[PDB]
Amino acid sequence: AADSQQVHEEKLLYWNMAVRDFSILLNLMKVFDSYPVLHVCLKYGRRFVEAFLKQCMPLLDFSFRKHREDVLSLLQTLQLNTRLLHHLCGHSKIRQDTRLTKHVPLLKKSLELLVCRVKAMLVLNNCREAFWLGTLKNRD
Structure with missing residues (x-):
């Protein structure tokens, strides 16, 4: 259970x-064009963020105490996935009417x-070791 x-x-x-x-791809893709490209991110994100809460979050707390380096690193990749989804909601082509407004609120x-x-994961005894090895092992 712990090793798996x-x-x-x-x-x-x-x-x-x-x-x-x-x-990021579609956001540099939507640069020279797209209608549907933003649509893909919008709906899938809703199902992605939904997958995070109900599956990966319960596991994070599950293994949070045994392995901090794998847990704090996974929370850093979540933060960067979220930073993109925010810049996605308020957006250039979303400044165009209709279709894109039936999505933004649910995300x-x-x-x-x-x-x-x-947030609550961010505050438990913050120690730079959890962040340190969740960085260089997050490298690539």
Whole structure:
């Protein structure tokens, strides 16, 4: 349960590194154009952020005490995935009418949840070792 938890965190680590890879892609893609490109991020994010709360968050607290280095690193990849989703909500092409407004609120509401789940994780005995090895092992 504890030793198998390490292998599940390493997947959730660069699966997040993946969503943040995509998010940025379409934001440099929407630069020279798109209607639907923003649409993909909007809806999938809603299902991604939904997957975080109900699956990966309970596991974070699960293994949080045994392995801090894998847990604090996973919370850093979550923060960067969220920074993109925020810059995505308020957005250039979202300043265009209709279709993009039926999305933003459902992401906003569940993100103010996920974000506030990280806050309480951020304050437990903050120590730079948890952050340090959750950095250089977050490298690539």
